[PDB]
Design a protein around this ligand. Structure first.
Ligand SMILES: [K+]
Length: 436
């Protein structure tokens, strides 16, 4: 078992490219697997979650060559009906995304599948997908609406018109995938817009989409192979953006980062707090916009986080709360109860760690109240959550003393080369032997 140990930073500098987007990587390889023809995937995130998605597809006879050192996949698609019944339960590891997407993919197959994963994954809520999939005629056994899930494939799924009562957590993507195999059209309508990585990829693979506040697909179409280049993960960049923001003497450039508007919340909010962040060299390679992000040290003020930014920033709140901890004044986060049902309860985790580092932090059922202050050295627990681990690694840049973050083995689920890149820009992090 291993921990991260930090010492304060004298300032970040240089230019780095963060690894590929986790969310786009999952969808890219899944769609490529069932496409017709050969898809080359560049920038695939070679992390534990995305490789679990790869292994899972391979158990069902996807043809995927992994070239790990180059972040490349070469996928020979097996076509829409080309998958084969896997012999054992599919282990999604730590990956909520993989299990929810596979559920959509597998609901309409002519075979049965069991989906499971690690302890954390077996606590992630699935009611949100089970219910709509069932409306389409899926049959999914589960206890307490958490994995493991047993899917009894139904090749005669029916399109539904569904209005999700919540900015989807892969619910839209899940139903869209099921929609490809359903008879008729499947229409998903949502209160507020959410991530659209799936829609962009469906278009990329030439599957017809329509189109106003809702989105529809009709089943029985074909996915057509089309090479894809995956942008840097802005959720991964977020750690360095906060680090360069709060560490005096810092100036860095993050190259080739995805800047999808539905993912830009951390930038939007930091700027509101007074951050110094410039987006340049904006380009549009296939489907996903990417840009370079230049960050310089800046003093921050606490803010009331606007409710409309919450969906745009949900995954960056761990590291954003570090910025709040060192800002001048109070920060209030509301409407973010979804933080409690992630890999760990992220509100409880962040509040626990912040208090251990000398920050006045207070939990709400749907968020947190932070009084900006001074980070001390100390020791915190990652709660096995990659973003909690990395958030406190970022805390270490400004903490008065060393920060020990226990149990960081799961950082590689989303950011395999985190330690290397951190030390490269001047964020001091070392992996050391942990306990237990
Ligand atoms: K995960």
């Amino acid at each position: 078992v291993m921990d991260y140990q930090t010492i304060p930073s004298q300032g970040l500098s240089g230019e780095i490219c963060v690894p590929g987007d986790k969310s786009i990587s999952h969808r890219a390889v899944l769609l490529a697997a069932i496409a017709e023809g050969q898809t080359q995937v560049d920038g695939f995130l070679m992390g534990a979650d995305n490789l679990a998605m790869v292994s899972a597809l391979q158990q069902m006879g996807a043809s995927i060559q992994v070239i790990e050192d180059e972040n490349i996949l070469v996928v020979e698609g097996v076509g829409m009906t080309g998958l084969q019944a896997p012999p054992e339960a599919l282990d999604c590891g730590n990956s909520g995304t993989a299990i929810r997407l596979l559920s959509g993919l597998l609901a309409g197959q002519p075979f049965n599948t069991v989906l499971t994963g690690d302890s954390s994954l077996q606590r992630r809520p699935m009611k949100r997908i089970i219910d709509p999939l069932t409306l389409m005629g899926a049959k999914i056994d589960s206890t307490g609406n958490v994995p493991p899930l047993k899917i009894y494939g139904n090749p005669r799924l029916t399109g539904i018109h569904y209005q999700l009562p919540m900015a989807s957590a892969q619910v839209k993507s899940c139903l869209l995938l099921a929609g490809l195999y359903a008879r008729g059209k499947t229409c998903i309508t949502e209160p507020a817009p959410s991530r659209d990585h799936t829609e962009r990829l469906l278009k990329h693979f030439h599957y017809t989409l329509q189109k106003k506040q809702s989105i529809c697909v009709s089943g029985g179409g074909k996915l057509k192979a089309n090479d894809i280049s995956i942008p840097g993960d802005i959720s991964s960049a977020a750690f360095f953006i906060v680090a360069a923001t709060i560490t005096p003497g810092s100036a860095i450039r993050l190259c080739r980062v995805g800047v999808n508007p539905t993912r830009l919340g951390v930038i939007n909010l930091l700027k509101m707090m007074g951050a110094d962040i410039e987006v340049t060299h904006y380009t549009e390679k296939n489907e996903e916009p990417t840009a370079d992000i230049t960050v310089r040290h800046a003093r921050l003020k606490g803010i009331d986080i606007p409710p409309d930014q919450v969906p745009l920033t949900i995954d960056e709140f761990p590291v954003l709360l570090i910025a709040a901890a060192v800002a001048q004044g109070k920060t209030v986060l509301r409407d973010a109860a979804e933080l409690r049902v992630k890999e760990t309860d992220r509100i409880a985790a962040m509040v626990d760690g912040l208090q251990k580092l000398g920050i006045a932090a207070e939990s709400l059922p749907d968020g947190v109240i932070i009084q900006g202050g001074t980070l001390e050295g100390g020791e915190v627990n990652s709660y096995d959550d990659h973003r909690i681990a990395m958030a406190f690694a970022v805390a270490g840049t400004l903490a008065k003393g060393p920060v020990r973050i226990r149990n960081c083995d799961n950082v590689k689920t989303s950011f395999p080369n985190f330690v290397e890149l951190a030390n490269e820009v001047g964020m001091n992090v070392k992996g050391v032997r942990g306990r237990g």
